[PDB]
Design a binder for these strands. Structure first.
Ligand SMILES: [Mg+2]
Ligand SMILES: [Mg+2]
Length: 328
RNA sequence: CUUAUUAAAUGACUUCUCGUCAACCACCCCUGACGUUGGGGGCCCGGUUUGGCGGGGCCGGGGGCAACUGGCUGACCAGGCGGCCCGGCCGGGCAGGGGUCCGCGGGGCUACCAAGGACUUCCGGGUGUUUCGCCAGCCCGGACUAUCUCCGGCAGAACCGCUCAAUGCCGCGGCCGCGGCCUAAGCCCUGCGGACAGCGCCGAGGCGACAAUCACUCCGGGAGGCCGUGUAUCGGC
DNA sequence: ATCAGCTCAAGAGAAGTCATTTAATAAG
DNA sequence: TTGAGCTGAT
């Protein structure tokens, strides 16, 4: 196991051992820290030598989930898996339907204006902006704590003109130029063909393994089966839909969404909670209200653990946007 | 790299409307005290007529066992903002004057650096869970008309409403000698009648930050290399 | 008097037109 | 995807 180290100037250093991590914290020379992805690291409180060896990052994008791996010049140091749960198209469809009904029943007749709705600069649909921004944040937060010098990614391609079914390629092809533009600001980029990915996978023998095979290809590092495996997913909430849509008996509409409501906790926050004499660490599914004076907490995969008394919940970290999960 | 063809992804405007909830009126049915009056119900699902969607009229079945419906009004983010009015920037409010589409008609103009506006361009504003902050989308104002972006109609077409359905037809110029004259189904303005609204616009979308984040093994507070600035997988024994 | 376990319901669609980004191919 | 209702228990 290795602990990432970050210098007083904000550069990543080379990773150190857990023993050095312990003693640097104990002696007060460095502060322990967690990344936005929850990865533990240490920030120095002293200048130290800045010499580092090569480190490379690989990202193998999928539609539903991605593989990520980090390798030193010697070995793979990390494997990870990233989930993006495809929530935005339904949310935009429901918002569109509600807008259409609202305008129908609440506005006069209005002119149809569709001929000249020009778009200025580069454009992406909200779903593709969502997935690009998530993948960029993952990469950008990995490059924050590791001395990444090279980014490796497969350049997905599909012949849409000859096969109509290609949905799960379109969702990853679209937005690639913005991704590649943003990648090159972090580190030098090596694009990889799908055939090269296949060849390296078959040579060396969870899709983080495929991203690791792209590393073993480009940089020749050894495989590391003992490397830790992490699961990360973007947190999803009902951000502005404050109430349920259909009026129920006597015309009531129950409240639904909102990430903040003037309380202490907020839905993205990471918390430790007690219930039935047992301790849980999780993320705030639900907020206290005048009637429902409980905090809903969910596990790393987004399923609610339960509802908790607000006295028994301790705030660990405010919303990072991600959950995290180490796989034993 | 410009333009085009095919195919995916998912964003916008508009029309038509389902779905949910609530109140009142009219009619019908079961049942109760003695036609007056009182409790409750009058519901669903599938098929069909159309190019298609929603009403309506038919066909059939379920579930009740009681046969099986009309009219009309209000609500579906919380709220925010603009126009104008009344009282004294706070309180209350929608009278006036605006917005769009359709039918018939008129005035001025022009043939693509068009007619001359704006879903063009530039600047700015409203809205957009919030602890703070940013963005997408929509809408609006002023300044020009921006290094150029955009501007139509008929049939099919009906039991009704809407719709550029598949398809078919027209206009996107004509005439003369690059230039000139003329003229629209194109551009600007506008009259009378009808439709939507009852004063309008935006509200169910994406995200950043937060030090409360103190780890990993292993013993029973400590251990899990010393040095090259107490980083290092690189170098040194 | 309040903690914990278990349960419940939850808005959706046709059509006209238009617009980006990413393929494979044209033609310049 | 999340607030809220209901019950049993101490
Ligand atoms: Mg707000
Ligand atoms: Mg047609």
């Amino acid at each position: 196991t290795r602990v990432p180290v970050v210098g007083v100037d904000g550069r990543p250093l080379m990773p150190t051992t857990p023993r050095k991590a312990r003693l640097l914290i104990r002696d007060g020379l460095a502060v322990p820290r967690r990344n936005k992805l929850g990865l533990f690291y240490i920030q120095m409180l002293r200048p130290v030598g800045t010499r580092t060896q090569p480190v490379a990052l690989a990202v193998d994008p999928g539609a539903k989930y991605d593989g990520v791996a980090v390798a030193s010049h010697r070995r793979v140091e990390l494997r990870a898996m990233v989930f993006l749960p495809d929530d935005v198209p339904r949310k935009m469809e429901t918002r569109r339907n509600l807008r259409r009904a609202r305008r129908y029943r609440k506005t006069p007749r209005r002119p149809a204006r569709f001929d000249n709705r020009r778009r200025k600069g580069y454009w992406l649909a909200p779903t593709q902006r969502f997935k690009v921004e998530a993948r960029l944040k993952v990469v950008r937060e990995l490059c924050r704590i590791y001395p990444v010098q090279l980014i490796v990614t497969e350049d997905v391609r599909f012949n849409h003109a000859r096969d109509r079914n290609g949905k799960y390629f379109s969702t990853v092809e679209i937005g690639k130029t913005l991704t590649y533009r943003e990648y090159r600001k972090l580190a030098e980029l090596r694009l990889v063909e799908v055939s090269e990915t296949d060849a390296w996978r078959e040579r060396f023998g969870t899709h983080a393994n495929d991203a690791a095979a792209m590393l073993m290809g480009v940089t020749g590092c050894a495989h590391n089966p003992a490397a830790p495996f992490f699961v990360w997913r973007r947190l999803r909430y009902a951000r502005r839909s404050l109430f349920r849509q259909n009026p129920q008996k006597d015309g009531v509409r129950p409240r639904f969404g909102g990430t903040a409501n003037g309380g202490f906790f907020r839905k993205g926050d990471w918390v430790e909670a007690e219930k039935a004499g047992k301790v849980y660490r999780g993320w705030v599914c639900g907020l206290p209200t005048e009637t429902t004076k409980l905090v809903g907490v969910a596990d790393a995969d987004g399923k609610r653990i339960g509802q908790f008394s607000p006295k028994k919940v301790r705030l660990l970290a405010r919303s990072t946007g991600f959950s995290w999960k180490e796989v034993a």
